[PDB]
Design a protein around this nucleic acid. Structure first.
Ligand code: SF4
Ligand code: CA
Ligand code: CA
Length: 349
DNA sequence: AAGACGTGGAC
DNA sequence: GTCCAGTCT
């Protein structure tokens, strides 16, 4: 029904001919492949390149990453987003050391048991670093495979992902799966793109049923995004007479887990300053200086910055921490509060 | 199932 | 504005 062998030759050829020279394709090392594939989840290649090199420069081996403390690994991830990925990788790596003594499992079932390792990562790491013919179905693969085979099912469904995963089994090159998988991902990245794909340039344009029908731009099928919720947030930038600033470490559960931030509180509506004042007193503000929005995937933060002065009438208890201005750079803030700071600094000038 | 979970490019 | 570059619960 489908000439796989020919398909697999025109794909791998184009790949060897067009592949990008990315930092994590310098070698087939499980550790570096693993880090790169976690960074790449929901994150474009061009964004990841700098982070991958800072990260591997700071954590060259699996044991270096395991031996580091949360703050250091999480600082290395500052600005990337979806920060539970690095908490799960940090733990998944601490596991391979305490349990497996540092060697990355090559058994699919054994590798998936680690936190952060979903179906894609199992296929990406094992097929590249060990040759295991497990599929690595990402958004690129799902877009390619849906166009090639005219699969008209909602990709958002996990069931559709499992269908694609069986298609991959059927047309794979079991000889060299890692090369086969990266070629599908690369194909979707460079040629068969979400919009106006270069089907003429495409090396497998003869096989693409969508091109034959002229409906490539109508695929893949994915339902429209759910509208996100708006959330007013009030932020306080408090500095004493020695220039030190107060910050707190968010809890390890939920949004922006274990990241540092300037004291804040969700304000249903009115009395932003009052709510900030009372909340800080339990565990001296002035008017706001700026207000802006910051988007998440599932909600929007409408922030409002309140400068303030604090006088020490007691000790700074957890989760709070009194940090000089020069030492803030050592803490990992989300992008929202990195701007809060920048806004406060330029206002005071 | 589908909401939670960051941030930035390309239309 | 829209779409999009995965995993956990
Ligand atoms: S022929 Fe066109 S639609 Fe099909 S895979 Fe190639 S770029 Fe995508
Ligand atoms: Ca798993
Ligand atoms: Ca929480």
């Amino acid at each position: 029904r489908f000439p796989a062998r020919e398909f697999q030759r025109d794909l791998l050829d184009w790949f060897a001919r067009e592949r990008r020279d990315l930092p994590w394709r310098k070698d087939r090392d499980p550790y570096k492949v693993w880090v790169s594939e976690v960074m790449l989840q929901q994150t474009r290649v061009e964004t990841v390149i700098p982070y991958f090199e800072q990260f591997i420069d700071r954590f060259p081996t699996l044991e270096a990453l395991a031996d580091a403390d949360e703050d250091e690994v999480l600082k290395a991830w500052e600005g990337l987003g979806y920060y539970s990925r690095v908490r799960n990788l940090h733990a998944a790596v601490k596991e391979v050391k305490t349990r497996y003594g540092g060697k990355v499992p090559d058994d699919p079932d054994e590798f998936s048991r680690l936190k952060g390792v979903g179906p894609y990562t199992v296929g990406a790491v094992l097929s590249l670093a060990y040759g295991v013919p497990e599929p690595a179905v990402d958004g690129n693969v799902m877009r390619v495979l849906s166009r090639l085979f005219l699969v008209t099912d909602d990709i958002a469904k996990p069931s559709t992902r499992k269908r694609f995963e069986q298609i991959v089994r059927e047309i794979m090159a079991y000889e060299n799966p890692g090369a086969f998988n990266e070629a599908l991902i690369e194909l979707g990245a460079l040629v068969c793109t979400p919009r106006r794909p270069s089907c003429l340039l495409c090396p497998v344009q003869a096989y693409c049923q969508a091109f034959a029908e002229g409906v490539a731009e109508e695929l893949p099928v994915k339902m429209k995004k759910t509208a996100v919720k708006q959330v007013p947030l009030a932020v306080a930038v408090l500095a004493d007479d020695e220039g030190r600033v107060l910050i707190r470490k968010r809890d390890s559960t939920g949004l922006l887990a274990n990241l540092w931030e300037f004291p804040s509180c969700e304000t249903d509506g009115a009395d932003g300053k009052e709510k900030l004042e009372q909340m800080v007193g339990e565990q001296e503000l002035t008017e706001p200086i700026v207000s802006f929005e910051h988007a998440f995937s599932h909600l929007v933060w409408q922030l409002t910055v309140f400068p303030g002065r604090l006088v020490h009438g007691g000790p700074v208890e957890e989760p709070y921490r009194l940090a000089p201005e020069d030492e803030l750079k050592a803490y990992a803030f989300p992008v929202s509060h990195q701007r809060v700071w920048r806004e406060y600094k330029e206002w005071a000038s």
